[PDB]
Amino acid sequence: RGWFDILDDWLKRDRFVFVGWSGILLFPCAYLALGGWLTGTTFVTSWYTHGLASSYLEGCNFLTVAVSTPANSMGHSLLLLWGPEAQGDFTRWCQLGGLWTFIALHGAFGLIGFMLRQFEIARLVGVRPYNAIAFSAPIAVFVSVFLIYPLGQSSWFFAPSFGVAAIFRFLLFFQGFHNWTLNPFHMMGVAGVLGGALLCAIHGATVENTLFQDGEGASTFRAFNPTQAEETYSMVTANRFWSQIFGIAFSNKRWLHFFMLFVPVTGLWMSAIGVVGLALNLRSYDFISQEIRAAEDPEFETFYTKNLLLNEGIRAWMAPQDQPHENFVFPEEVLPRGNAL
Amino acid sequence: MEPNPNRQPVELNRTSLYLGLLLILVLALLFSSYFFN
Amino acid sequence: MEVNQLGLIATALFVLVPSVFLIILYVQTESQQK
């Protein structure tokens, strides 16, 4: 019972907001990431890094504000406030995009903090740490998309900017330049997210519609006691229903809930692997057989070649404004266009 | 030789067989286009 | 079409090896004393 243990005592008190040892990492970093995003989106421009307005102060709305990435010329600079670029100047630092690295880095350590929180509380309460384990998927996604992906590319500039419309742009960029929808890792991601959503929906609805009548009320929520021992719905009836409707059905509850962990978590991990590939332009962009055929045979058309024409449009029409450091000037006559449009 | 006390039987029930085969076959259906390229 | 010539053996082993793994485990599970 020395100072370390007294401190431990205090950190682990059962208060409205649990603190813990992990709270020392988590709360300042989460607070700085949130506050940094709100500060940036409220007051801070993107004129000198992107040639964009990005704040409420400049006239943007909720959908168009962002804390934007730094200029491409910053490369992968940590862009510390006291670093060789800003040199201690807070204003210049804002103008150079310091808030982007501020938010991403404090954010990353905040996510570490939060997962540590999940472990810490699970250990204190006596449960298995499967919540934290599940949280590894958010981590994989954040680290692959916001850190590894730009690190593979020329600079932080091509990371996603923190904003609604900015993220939408990130998506369209990935379609145009990476053909990301063609990527089997993205596809596994989609299957995990949509499958997760499906499981959420179907499990909730099934439990709600195989409830035992445990009260007299027509509003049936009150007919449950948290301390009760009995299942509140019929697993046997659920099983027969889905067996006769869909052919197969869960019969093991433990398996059901593990599966609910497994599907979305795995999906997100796969999507992460794909983005790690896109960090190097290691894309699933093309099918070589497709291209050999199409190149030789001008009547051969599939939705794959159709989509590449779309991608070509995206790149040519978006690059000059989306990549201002390149100083692209694409004369009218070279822009790809179909008839009339 | 004296028997090793650390041995354990291994199991794979039928549902796991079916799930596993689904995973393998579907992953194959997904990835094969890319293997052919 | 000029597909990759290893594509076939790739898909075949990709399916057969793990499927066979599972079939072995299943069959030897069934045969264990009930």
Binding site: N239, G247 | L21, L29 | -
Partner: peptide, 30 residues
Amino acid sequence: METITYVFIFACIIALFFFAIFFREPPRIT
């Protein structure tokens, strides 16, 4: 061979649906 492979995998999956459904291990109440 490609077409044969794709259709073969699909066919195996459909057969799998059949066994998974009609030859499942029956759920038993305890």
